From TrEMBL:
Similarity comment text for this entry: Belongs to the peptidase C1 family.
GO biological process: post-transcriptional regulation of gene expression; proteolysis involved in protein catabolic process
Broad class of enzyme this protein falls into: hydrolase
GO cellular component, one term: extracellular space
Entry keyword set: Hydrolase, Signal
CDD domains named in the record: Peptidase_C1A_CathepsinB
Function: Thiol protease which is required for parasite excystation and invasion of the proximal small intestine of the human host.
EC code(s) of this entry: 3.4.22.-
Designated name of the protein: Cysteine peptidase C (CPC)
Domain of life of the organism encoding this protein: Eukaryota
GO MF annotations in UniProt: cysteine-type endopeptidase activity
Amino acid sequence: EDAPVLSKAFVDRVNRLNRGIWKAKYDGVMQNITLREAKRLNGVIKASILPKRRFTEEEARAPLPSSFDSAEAWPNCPTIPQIADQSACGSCWAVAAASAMSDRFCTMGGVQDVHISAGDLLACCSDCGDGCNGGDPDRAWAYFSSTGLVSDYCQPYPFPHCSHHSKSKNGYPPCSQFNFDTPKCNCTCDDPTIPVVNYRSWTSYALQGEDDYMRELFFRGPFEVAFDVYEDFIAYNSGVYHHVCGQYLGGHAVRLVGWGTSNGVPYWKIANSWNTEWGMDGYFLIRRGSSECGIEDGGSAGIPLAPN
Ligand SMILES: *[C@@H]1O[C@H](CO)[C@@H](O[C@@H]2O[C@H](CO)[C@@H](O[C@@H]3O[C@H](CO)[C@@H](O)[C@H](O)[C@@H]3O)[C@H](O)[C@H]2NC(C)=O)[C@H](O)[C@H]1NC(C)=O
Ligand SMILES: *[C@@H]1O[C@H](CO)[C@@H](O[C@@H]2O[C@H](CO)[C@@H](O)[C@H](O)[C@H]2NC(C)=O)[C@H](O)[C@H]1NC(C)=O
């Protein structure tokens, strides 16, 4: 449990079972992560309480391109290419939700650059689950509708950037010296001289399957998906992931941003929440079409309401 997840032996058998479609790395940023540390990162816990997306006749007939990138589609939205760090907490369900909400304020909500507070969601939605011990993406978006959230400016994410590297390029403190509990729920801003601006959605819905994902992304931008994390994913470095090896570590929520083809392999482009040192500058590609690790089973999304 305090034993390391990864080994040269493990990674070498992954690089041979995956046939070179993707690349795993032993001596990368997660070389020393413990089973306990890797499990904590995967905080999705709990058919759907949200109605299924209904596309209009016009949405349904759009001929979707062979490849798509949200940052390229909305180049005046600076939150889309930013990468989150959940830190040493099982908060992915809240961090992925808040990231896509920020993005959607720019693609739909008439607001170029607001960061919705992951920390507010994590601490104040007890409906959603148990904070840093995990929660439900679906209920995160229902809370954004029913109650609303404050910005990052009002309540900064309480947990600092940390590295699994013992000597980090960005100089962050090691994640090994940290084990955080659910923060206190606050009504006003951390700095009491900053006034509270409340942000709310008017509707929340669910996406299921490949067509739902591409069509929703194309019209309205990034949203929250979840998948099963296996030990081999922790060592991911490049290319299009598919599970070949290792035990289940839990469910993990991420932000979907695009799709494409790499040498005949169809993929999703995804923003993880483990900072820019991990994977492809914080992104990974995963196989598209076969619900790889269940990634196509359930997305969560909503439409933000323009302020004043
Ligand atoms: C809601 O309000 C409280 C503040 O009343 C926030 O909790 C506080 O979070 C800070 C981190 O910004 C904690 O400070 C840290 O303390 C540890 C040692 O205890 C130390 O390693 C660091 O140097 C750091 O200063 C603070 O202890 C904690 N206080 C209490 C009373 O809980 C909370 O994070 C806010 N909620 C949200 C969603 O932001
Ligand atoms: C994982 O931990 C090991 C040590 O426990 C790291 O390897 C050492 O790195 C230190 C500097 O931090 C150097 O003194 C040595 O070159 C290494 N020693 C041994 C025994 O290998 C390793 O780099 C850590 N990995 C990461 C990516 O942080």
